[PDB]
Amino acid sequence: PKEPEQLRKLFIGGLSFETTDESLRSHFEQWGTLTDCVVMRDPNTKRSRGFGFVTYATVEEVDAAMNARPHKVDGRVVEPKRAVHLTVKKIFVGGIKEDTEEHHLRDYFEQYGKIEVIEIMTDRGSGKKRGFAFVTFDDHDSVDKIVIQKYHTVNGHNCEVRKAL
Numbered sequence: 001p002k003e004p005e006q007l008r009k010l011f012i013g014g015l016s017f018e019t020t021d022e023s024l025r026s027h028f029e030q031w032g033t034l035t036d037c038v039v040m041r042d043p044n045t046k047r048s049r050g051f052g053f054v055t056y057a058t059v060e061e062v063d064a065a066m067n068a069r070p071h072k073v074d075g076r077v078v079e080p081k082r083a084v085h086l087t088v089k090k091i092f093v094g095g096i097k098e099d100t101e102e103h104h105l106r107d108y109f110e111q112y113g114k115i116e117v118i119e120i121m122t123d124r125g126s127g128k129k130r131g132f133a134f135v136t137f138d139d140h141d142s143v144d145k146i147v148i149q150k151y152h153t154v155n156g157h158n159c160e161v162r163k164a165l
């Protein structure tokens with residue numbers, strides 16, 4: 001069956017006020033089938049609110065659109081984000097215990113995005129591993145993909161992953 005619609009939507013901020021449902025659709029249809037595409041407008045003036053949303057038929061199409069950023073739509077670089085926004089580039093990874101190392105976290109998380117920092121947390125007094133880590137990516141979409149998954153398995157551990165700061 002189909003992925004939930006919420007996970008197939010992209011909120012597009014920073015639109016040109018000249019962008020229309022039709023021009024937004026013509027642009028974003030390059031990366032997949034769009035089941036919905038709307039520019040938000042003022043109810044009285046019909047002047048654009050400068051943002052809108054598109055709904056793809058599949059999550060893989062959302063991924064393709066995000067991987068094709070930056071998007072210049074009607075002459076303006078826009079800001080697409082997956083639907084709920086707390087936009088951050090860093091995650092907390094908990095439940096990794098004492099045997100999880102940098103390469104375990106890198107080999108898994110590098111498939112969500114480009115990693116800039118991996119910080120495996122150690123005890124200030126003893127140096128022993130505390131069983132959690134932070135991963136910083138170059139871009140927020142990695143984190144957005146990560147936190148919507150129900151499960152993360154790293155080094156055989158069932159991990160708790162959340163947005164950090």
Ligand SMILES: Cn1cc(C(N)=O)c(C(F)F)n1
Nearest residue numbers: 086087088089138139140141
């Ligand atoms: C400066 N900066 C870059 C990003 C990004 N590419 O994802 C963010 C975050 F807020 F979305 N901040």
